[PDB]
């Protein structure tokens, strides 16, 4: 019975179904993305790009472009160089 022939592993099909249902994150308008970013920054001062991507629910490239427009990367002793959501 071990290693029985299966077309696709069960866990993989579940994961694929979840990903397909969720879909790719859509590129929203600059205004709304900026507003969401500013509220997120209001929560507190420092954000990592990964969790910021999770919060904004935007493509990584588009979010990086918008964030490079205003925010600036600071090299810091927290753990690493991260983004700063304050424009100045």
């Amino acid at each position: 019975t071990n290693y029985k022939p299966v077309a696709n592993h069960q866990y993989n099909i579940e994961y694929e179904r979840k990903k397909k249902e969720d879909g790719k994150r859509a590129r929203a308008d600059k205004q709304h993305v900026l507003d969401m970013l500013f509220s997120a920054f209001e929560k507190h001062q420092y954000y990592n790009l990964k969790d910021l991507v999770d919060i904004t629910k935007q493509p990584v490239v588009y979010l990086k472009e918008i964030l490079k427009e205003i925010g600036v990367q600071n090299v810091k002793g927290i753990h690493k160089n991260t983004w700063e959501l304050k424009p100045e």
């Binding site: 879909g23 790719k24 994150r25 859509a26 590129r27």
Partner: protein, 179 residues
Amino acid sequence: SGIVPQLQNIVSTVNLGCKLDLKTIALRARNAEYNPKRFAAVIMRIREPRTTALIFSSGKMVCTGAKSEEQSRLAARKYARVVQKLGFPAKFLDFKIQNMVGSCDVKFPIRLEGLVLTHQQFSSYEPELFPGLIYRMIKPRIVLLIFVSGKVVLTGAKVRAEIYEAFENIYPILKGFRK
């Protein structure tokens, strides 16, 4: 040979030469749908030519489902005119047929095993993956799906001449393996 393939689908790409707003097109068009989470273009369908077109924000459009070259061009023009009616400066630039699909029947069963044995350099027969034999013709760059029932489907053609020539090339070979 006495048999001519009949086209089942034609893919043609044309550039409108102007950027577009996908959301506006979706809101204002009749049969258009836009799901940026699913796909980045706008899917529209017209019943009279019985075709479907994908419209991108870059101004390039792809028309599929047309059974004839004239139908493809007319459908592309109709989609461009619909977009133009929505206020955009849509044009008809560099219309081209990217791919054509044709189907036919040889009216006899075929021994795909012998065919792949004889033409292993061009044949690919994997019943586990797909019951139809895949033949990659070289002189015309055409891919043929040959089935034991005799149905043959040709794809990858830019002009109808390629479809007809590929079938003309493949027919004697298939006749050599009649079951």
